[PDB]
Amino acid sequence: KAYLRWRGLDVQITDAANESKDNVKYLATLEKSMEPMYQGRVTDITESLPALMTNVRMMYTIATAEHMTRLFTKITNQLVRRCKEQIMEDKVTLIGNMKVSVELANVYRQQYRLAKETLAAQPEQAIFLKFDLSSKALHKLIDMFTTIHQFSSLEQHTHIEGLDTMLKSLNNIIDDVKRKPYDLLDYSRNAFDTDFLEFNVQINDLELQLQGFVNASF
Amino acid sequence: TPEEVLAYWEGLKAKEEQMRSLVSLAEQRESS
């Protein structure tokens, strides 16, 4: 009465065991070049990634959709994790860390697109969504901080008789944005995109105020 | 029978590709 169920389970168990051995042995080959990216530095991943795609390309010539989706989703999750950690520890450090992380995403997408071109040659939804939100929430802040630091050389010439409370206006403009409840590094909110386009108008207002000041003291 | 034939052909192709890859890797190692 139970022996039909037992032979069915035997067939299922042998097939599952065989595919598990192959899958585990091939996913284990990946490990010795995926190991650096759990705790190391953000720039190291740039040099590590070519080994990772050589490995993935040799192993996906054998055994498919689940491998691509799951592997790529977690490796890009780990890239986001490492970038977010390496930014979180001002100006030059912040701009450097954002440049490095954006360059990492750029070389990742470029070499994966070359990999797909080759894979087409011989015989990406998660990447899109996650690295697109990361790259937009990094581009906005990198351009905001580059503009702020370019306007930041004014910040110590306090003895000129017309640059006293204007810099306090610029400080308030910075502070009101940098007192808002949302986390700036998170793309989980995506509501700061109206705050940035309100900041961008009073930056040009500061520009034209200083231009009128120059025009007005001559 | 079709599954067995497909498995055998896949194994043969994998072995061939493996030999070619090993040769490529050896050449790259020698160059380095």
Partner: peptide, 12 residues
């Protein structure tokens, strides 16, 4: 295994 070894050796 041989391919993985050769790979690691070349990388090293």
């Amino acid at each position: 295994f041989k391919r993985i070894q050769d790979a690691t050796g070349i990388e090293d």
